[PDB]
């Protein structure tokens, strides 16, 4: 699990990544003075309570995450991120750079790829928020590898969504236009004939706290 192959590969980590590819698609993008997240939900049965166990999880008022891959692994990691954010705020009085929070989470993941008696987390996360530097968007994978982005995606439709954004994405769009772009990007990832039900959507702009779009505001984009 912590073993190099002859070519220098960590096969357990690359298998952890296969688990991530099975999760549903989520994306984030920076726009003029803000950042947003959009999560696809395949919600299934009418017997489910849809009003809970959400894909977009607030880490605090200024930072949110969405995950893909093993659901239980993901929850434990989101818990870790919340607590770790709180420890930083207690220590310094605030959280100046979200990048340090993402590194602490990614360090926890890296460690489960290096020590024996433990498997990697089968998870990918996107973190989005505003710190003292500005709006931020990062991703993080089973290995603890991180990147900061203008736009990005995770889950089964990752590659479709990113192909679309490479062509279509422009910096500094208004919130409404960015949401539209995102909704469109997400649609591109679907099988044709396959329709897109109520995605989760959340955004934040400089000077404010996160808003989660209510079920009504999301429709106006579908």
């Amino acid at each position: 699990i912590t073993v190099f192959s002859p070519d220098g590969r960590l096969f357990q980590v690359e298998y952890a990544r296969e688990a991530v590819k099975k999760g549903s698609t989520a994306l984030g993008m920076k726009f003029a003075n803000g950042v947003l997240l959009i999560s696809d939900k395949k919600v299934r049965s009418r017997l489910i309570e849809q009003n809970s166990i959400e894909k977009i999880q607030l880490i605090d008022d200024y930072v949110a995450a969405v995950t893909s891959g093993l659901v239980a692994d993901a929850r434990v990691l989101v818990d870790f991120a919340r607590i770790s954010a709180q420890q930083e705020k207690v220590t310094y009085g605030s959280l100046v750079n979200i990048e340090n929070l993402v590194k602490r989470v990614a360090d926890q993941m890296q460690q489960y790829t290096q020590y024996g008696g433990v498997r990697p987390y089968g998870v990918s996360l996107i973190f989005a928020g505003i710190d003292q530097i500005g709006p931020r968007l990062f991703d993080c994978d089973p290995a603890g590898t991180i990147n900061e982005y203008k736009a990005t995606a995770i889950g089964s439709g990752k590659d479709a969504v990113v192909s679309f954004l490479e062509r279509e994405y422009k910096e500094n769009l208004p919130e409404k236009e960015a949401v539209t772009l995102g909704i469109k990007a997400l649609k591109s990832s679907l099988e044709e004939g396959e329709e897109l039900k109520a995605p989760e959507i959340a955004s934040i702009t400089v000077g404010n706290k996160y808003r989660i779009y209510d079920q009504e505001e999301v429709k106006k984009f579908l």
Binding site: D60, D61, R82, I83, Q86, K89, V90
Partner: protein
């Protein structure tokens, strides 16, 4: 130090002064002793400054975490129970503080918490070296039927009286009003000063 918390029909009003002393030496005329710790929850602090400040940081962090995890604000009684457990656990090595916790859940609440974790709900309470003078003003003048406006005037008077007679109290009076409709609102300094004038007072 003087701090006060009163409940009214659908409101909590909390207030402090601001003097920080070391014995008789006035080091800071203007410290902060009243804090918002959740959407409809405020806390005042009295006692050892370092310990009280550590508690305020914890409480802001824990109430934020709880709210994210539970998707509802911690009930006011639950805040007091939490603090009560924390302070009692270390009662032989204590946080040397008195605390008031006030806010709105389904009803207004003010809680008084001591350094052993004794927590008791009351319609009003007061802490710090200036509190006996406040208790005198409130005994004589407090009414459960007061409006927010008269409750605000009441605590300014009470704290004005404490400042007059307690040399470890002084500086600008800080007031916050907590309602369901407006959340936690710190009254601006110029509104408090306007009230001091209208009522005939000083500092």
């Amino acid at each position: 130090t003087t701090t006060v918390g009163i409940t009214l029909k659908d409101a909590v009003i909390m207030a402090t002064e601001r003097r920080v002393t070391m014995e008789n030496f006035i080091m800071h005329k203007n410290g902060k002793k009243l804090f918002q710790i959740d959407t409809y929850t405020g806390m005042t602090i009295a006692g050892l400054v370092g310990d009280a400040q550590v508690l305020v940081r914890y409480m802001k962090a824990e109430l934020e975490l709880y709210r994210l995890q539970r998707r509802v604000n911690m009930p006011i009684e639950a805040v007091a129970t939490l603090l009560s457990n924390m302070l009692n656990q270390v009662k032989y090595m204590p946080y040397m503080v008195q605390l008031l916790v006030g806010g709105i859940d389904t009803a207004p609440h003010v809680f008084s918490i001591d350094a052993a974790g004794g927590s008791v709900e009351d319609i009003y309470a007061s802490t710090g070296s200036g509190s006996p003078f406040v208790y005198g003003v409130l005994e004589s003048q407090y009414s459960e039927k007061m409006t927010v406006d008269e409750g605000v005037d009441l605590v300014i008077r009470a704290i004005s009286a404490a400042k007059q007679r307690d040399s470890a109290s002084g500086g600008m009076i800080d007031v916050a009003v907590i309602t369901r409709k407006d959340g936690y609102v710190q009254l601006p300094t110029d509104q408090i000063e306007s009230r001091i004038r209208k009522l005939g007072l000083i500092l």
